[PDB]
Structure 1
Amino acid sequence: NIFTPIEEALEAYKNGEFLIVMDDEDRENEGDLIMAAELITQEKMAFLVRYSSGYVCVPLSEERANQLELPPMLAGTAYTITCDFAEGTTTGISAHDRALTTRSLANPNSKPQDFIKPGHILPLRAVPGLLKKRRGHTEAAVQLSTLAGLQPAGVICELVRDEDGLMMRLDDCIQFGKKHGIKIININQLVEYISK
């Protein structure tokens, strides 16, 4: 009565919807908004920033990050050097620009020289094996996109309360999901699905 079955969640994700993702069923877990990188629009990025910490990250597989020449920031959340997609962006930080950069990171046709570094988007490197190797939200994002038949790239950010800026625990996430019509799932639920 709280979490959406994975297969229904995958269709919503496939249809460009966000999913609220928790680690497991614990009430003290803090929620994250996650959606397909290739499907995030200016409006959806505006939504993500409005209700989150604003430290928007874009999980990519290590193979894809290597292809785009996005090395670890430092030669626990594997940040790569930040970036902006050059063509079509100005300030880089706008909802329009961050959305374009995110879709560009997912686009199979994008090339290393298409991006400016540093930038305003934080790409993350998901480990090979995804959730079977590391149960992080980074691996969850790429796993969701993979299961959805989309490019192995996602975009995420932490939900925050408007009242005091505290991260949203399960109860508030359930309220947020009902108010905005967003389904909720948890990583353990996802691991169970891909394991049997």
Structure 2
Amino acid sequence: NIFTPIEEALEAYKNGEFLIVMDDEDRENEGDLIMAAELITQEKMAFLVRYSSGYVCVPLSEERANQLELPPMLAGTAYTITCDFAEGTTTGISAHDRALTTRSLANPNSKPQDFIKPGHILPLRAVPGLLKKRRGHTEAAVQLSTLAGLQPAGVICELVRDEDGLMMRLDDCIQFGKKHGIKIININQLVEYISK
């Protein structure tokens, strides 16, 4: 009565809905909004930013990040050099621009030269094997997109309370899910599904 079954969640995700994603069933977990990178619109990015930390990240497979020439920022969260999609962006930071960059990172036709670096999106490198190898929200995002038959790219950000800026724990995530009609899953639940 809290968590949506994985197959129903995948259909929602396939249809461009967010999911609220927790690590497991624990009440003290903090929730992230995750949706498919290729499906995020200006409006959906506006929504993500409105209700989150705004430090918007785009999980990609290591293979995809390599293809796009997005190396690790340095040589734990695997940040690459940041980027903006060049054509059709101005400030890079607008909801429109961040959404366009995110969709572009997912698009199999995108080329390394299509992006300006640094920029205003934070791509993250998901490890090969995804949630079977590392139970990160990065791997969760790419796993969700893969299971949904979509490009191996997601977009994520942490839910934050309007009242005081504290991250939303489970109870607040339940309330947020009900208010906005967004389904909730957890990573343990997702690992159980993909395993056996």
| TM-score w.r.t. length of structure 2 | 1.00
Q: Please list every run of 5 or more consecutive structure 2 residues that lacks an aligned counterpart in the other structure.
A: none
Structure 1 residue 74: deviation in Å?
0.1
Structure 1 residue 21: deviation in Å?
0.1
For residues 8-59 of structure 1, what are the alpha-carbon distances to aligned partners after superposition, in whole Å with 9 as ceiling and x for unaligned? 0000000000000000000000000000000000000000000000000000
Whole-angstrom CA distance in 1 between matches of 2:4 and 2:77: 26
For residues 114-149 of structure 1, what are the alpha-carbon distances to aligned partners after superposition, in whole Å with 9 as ceiling and x for unaligned? 000000000000000000000000000000000000
User: Which residue is equivalent to 1:128?
Assistant: 128
Aligned residue for 1:118, secondary structure, equals strand
Aligned residue for 2:24, secondary structure, equals coil
Q: Please list every run of 5 or more consecutive structure 1 residues that lacks an aligned counterpart in the other structure.
A: none
Aligned residue for 1:20, secondary structure, equals strand
Aligned residue for 2:11, secondary structure, equals helix
User: Which residue is equivalent to 2:56?
Assistant: 56
Aligned residue for 1:116, secondary structure, equals strand
Structure 1 residue 75: deviation in Å?
1.7
- Taking only the aligned residue pairs, the percentage that are identical comes to 100
Whole-angstrom CA distance in 1 between matches of 2:189 and 2:14: 18
Aligned residue for 1:191, secondary structure, equals helix
User: Which residue is equivalent to 2:73?
Assistant: 73
Matched residues, number: 196
User: Which residue is equivalent to 1:180?
Assistant: 180
For residues 49-96 of structure 1, what are the alpha-carbon distances to aligned partners after superposition, in whole Å with 9 as ceiling and x for unaligned? 000000000000000000000000002000000000000000000000
| TM-score w.r.t. length of structure 1 | 1.00
- What's the Cα RMSD here? 0.3
Please list every run of at least 4 consecutive aligned residues from structure 1 whose deviation after the TM superposition is greater than 4 angstroms: none
